Structure formats: C-alpha cells, structure tokens
C-alpha cells in the first residue's frame, strides 16, 4: 500500500489545521500562504526568510539575542515601516535607552511615537493591552521582557516565578485582542519570560551579530544573522544575514545586491557587480553606494526579486 497513504495524510493535516490553526503542521518545503498584511523588516533577506515577506500582522513576535546584535534595530525598523504606511506605533520602554536620533535616521517619525515608561512590569503589559484594544495602533513594541519586574518584587516582598505568571496571564489575555485588532506586538527578549512568550509568540527571531563589518577605516556596521526559530505562518528554520551600519541601520541597499546575486539578477564578474548589462560598481560597498544614490533602479532589483518569490 502506497498512494492512499498520501491521501489519508492530506486529510490528517486538514483535520489538524482545522482545529489547531493554519500553521499547525507544515512541510519545510511548502511555499504556502501569502497575505496582504505584512510589515516589511527593512531587509529583503529577513523579509523572505520570514517566507511571508515581512512580519505577520495580528500576531506577537519575539526577537531575542545577545546585547549589541540587531534586535531593537530590527524592531525600530519594523516600527519605521508600520509607520510609513500611515499606521501608528507605541514603544513600551522598560530599560530607558532608546536613542531618537538613531530611530529618526532609520525612519521613525519619533514625534508621533507613542512612548511609555511603566514603573512595574504588570502596569507595563496593561498599558500595552488597552493601547492595543483600541484598534488604533498597527505595531506595538515592548522593550525587553527581562526588565518587566513585578509590583511585588518591586514593593520589596520577595518566592519568585513572579515574571512567569504575570507574562502568561497577560499573554493569554493579550494574545486575544491582537488577533482581533490587527496589531502586531513585538517583544524584545534578552539573550527570562521564556516559556510563556515562547509559546504564544507566533514568530520567534534569533538575532546575533556575526562579524564586525570591516571597511578600510575602523567599523561601519555589523553583519547580523537572524534565525527565525518559530513560524506559525511559514515554514520555519529559514534564516537571513545582513549588514547593520553604525548609525544608519540595516542597509536595504546591501541586502538588495546580496539577494541580487543569490538570485541571478545581479552578476559578479569578479570584483565588478553587474545588473542587466549596466555595471553597478566595484566592491559591495561601492555598489551599495551606487544603489542608494540611484533609488529608481534600486527598487527595480527589489521589484524583480519580489516577482520571482513573494
Ligand atoms: N546610535 C547609534 N549609532 C550607531 N549605531 C547604533 C546606534 N544604535 C544602535 N546602533 C547599532 O546597533 C547595534 C545594536 O542594535 P540596537 O538596536 O541598539 O540593539 P539590538 O540590536 O540589540 O536590539 C550596535 O552595535 C550598533 O551597530
Ligand atoms: F544592542 Al541590544 F539589545 F539593543 F543588545
């Protein structure tokens, strides 16, 4: 007995998907799904590494990694895009360390940015809940899961396992509104909420800095590598690398060439980087430079790789 198995299995998956959701069972090869709702990340690589071409709306994402790696950047980038399309964002601050200049440089209309700075972890998630429940916000981001210390541990009365309780609680309740409003919550994790977020979260991102981007002088950026460890929206375990310039953020340009060569649209005749005959430049950075100053052609590449995938 051979094929009827594949038909019994097709039903199996249908059965499951029915009671546990679209992404309850997947094949790592499935090119499946693709909505109209997606916040680009800033890098075409991470975009397609998400499969869905951006972040998924009405869902909670968790981006975790080591101090100084990419996260917040990625986040603020997700903030800057969910902004460029007239949506509005809130930044629930718990570390007190956002640098507006850098945000502005990435593109956050810092002025419209709903920022808040709670004095207890609990209060922190709630502000996020009602802010969410209004259906006004498109993207909301809670900076750091680890800094959300409980009122109790804050009042002095220290048991423990306060965090994992408060989180789960909030997450359970908070997971509902989200899918019912279309706001995507982004949680910066560090490295403790663990379990809770781990499961409610529909997309988990592992960000870590790979190499300290050498550029003649000292250092222009970092070549980050995000590893989407969980993806209830598209075949997980996919990943992406990209440069993050010091002060400039993710080089959408730098992403374009790399993808451009890994997809045949850009040819690298040894040192030179070609595109549809026209010579781009000599040296990834010289081409990055060329693209940024030549946006018209820049989104041309970005356009032609989209057609060939998402
Ligand atoms: N104001 C800034 N000027 C230059 N580079 C910055 C600045 N803020 C962040 N970065 C870059 O981002 C890296 C850390 O990213 P950031 O968003 O602060 O945090 P994370 O990536 O950990 O979420 C730094 O190593 C640096 O490359
Ligand atoms: F540089 Al970070 F979390 F902002 F490690």
Curated annotation (Swiss-Prot):
<dbReference type="InterPro" id="IPR020587">
    <property type="entry name" value="RecA_monomer-monomer_interface"/>
</dbReference>
<dbReference type="InterPro" id="IPR003593">
    <property type="entry name" value="AAA+_ATPase"/>
</dbReference>
<dbReference type="Pfam" id="PF00154">
    <property type="entry name" value="RecA"/>
</dbReference>
<comment type="function">
    <text>Can catalyze the hydrolysis of ATP in the presence of single-stranded DNA, the ATP-dependent uptake of single-stranded DNA by duplex DNA, and the ATP-dependent hybridization of homologous single-stranded DNAs. It interacts with LexA causing its activation and leading to its autocatalytic cleavage.</text>
</comment>
<protein>
    <recommendedName>
        <fullName>Protein RecA</fullName>
    </recommendedName>
</protein>
<feature type="binding site">
    <location>
        <begin position="65"/>
        <end position="72"/>
    </location>
    <ligand>
        <name>ATP</name>
    </ligand>
</feature>
<dbReference type="InterPro" id="IPR004042">
    <property type="entry name" value="Intein_endonuc_central"/>
</dbReference>
<comment type="function">
    <text>PI-MtuI is an endonuclease.</text>
</comment>
<dbReference type="InterPro" id="IPR006142">
    <property type="entry name" value="INTEIN"/>
</dbReference>
<dbReference type="InterPro" id="IPR003587">
    <property type="entry name" value="Hint_dom_N"/>
</dbReference>
<dbReference type="InterPro" id="IPR004860">
    <property type="entry name" value="LAGLIDADG_dom"/>
</dbReference>
<dbReference type="Pfam" id="PF14528">
    <property type="entry name" value="LAGLIDADG_3"/>
</dbReference>
<dbReference type="Pfam" id="PF21096">
    <property type="entry name" value="RecA_C"/>
</dbReference>
<dbReference type="InterPro" id="IPR036844">
    <property type="entry name" value="Hint_dom_sf"/>
</dbReference>
<comment type="similarity">
    <text>Belongs to the RecA family.</text>
</comment>
<dbReference type="InterPro" id="IPR049428">
    <property type="entry name" value="RecA-like_N"/>
</dbReference>
<dbReference type="InterPro" id="IPR020588">
    <property type="entry name" value="RecA_ATP-bd"/>
</dbReference>
<dbReference type="InterPro" id="IPR027417">
    <property type="entry name" value="P-loop_NTPase"/>
</dbReference>
<dbReference type="InterPro" id="IPR003586">
    <property type="entry name" value="Hint_dom_C"/>
</dbReference>
<dbReference type="InterPro" id="IPR013765">
    <property type="entry name" value="DNA_recomb/repair_RecA"/>
</dbReference>
<dbReference type="InterPro" id="IPR030934">
    <property type="entry name" value="Intein_C"/>
</dbReference>
<dbReference type="Pfam" id="PF14890">
    <property type="entry name" value="Intein_splicing"/>
</dbReference>
<dbReference type="InterPro" id="IPR006141">
    <property type="entry name" value="Intein_N"/>
</dbReference>
<dbReference type="InterPro" id="IPR049261">
    <property type="entry name" value="RecA-like_C"/>
</dbReference>
<dbReference type="InterPro" id="IPR023400">
    <property type="entry name" value="RecA_C_sf"/>
</dbReference>
<dbReference type="InterPro" id="IPR020584">
    <property type="entry name" value="DNA_recomb/repair_RecA_CS"/>
</dbReference>
<dbReference type="InterPro" id="IPR027434">
    <property type="entry name" value="Homing_endonucl"/>
</dbReference>
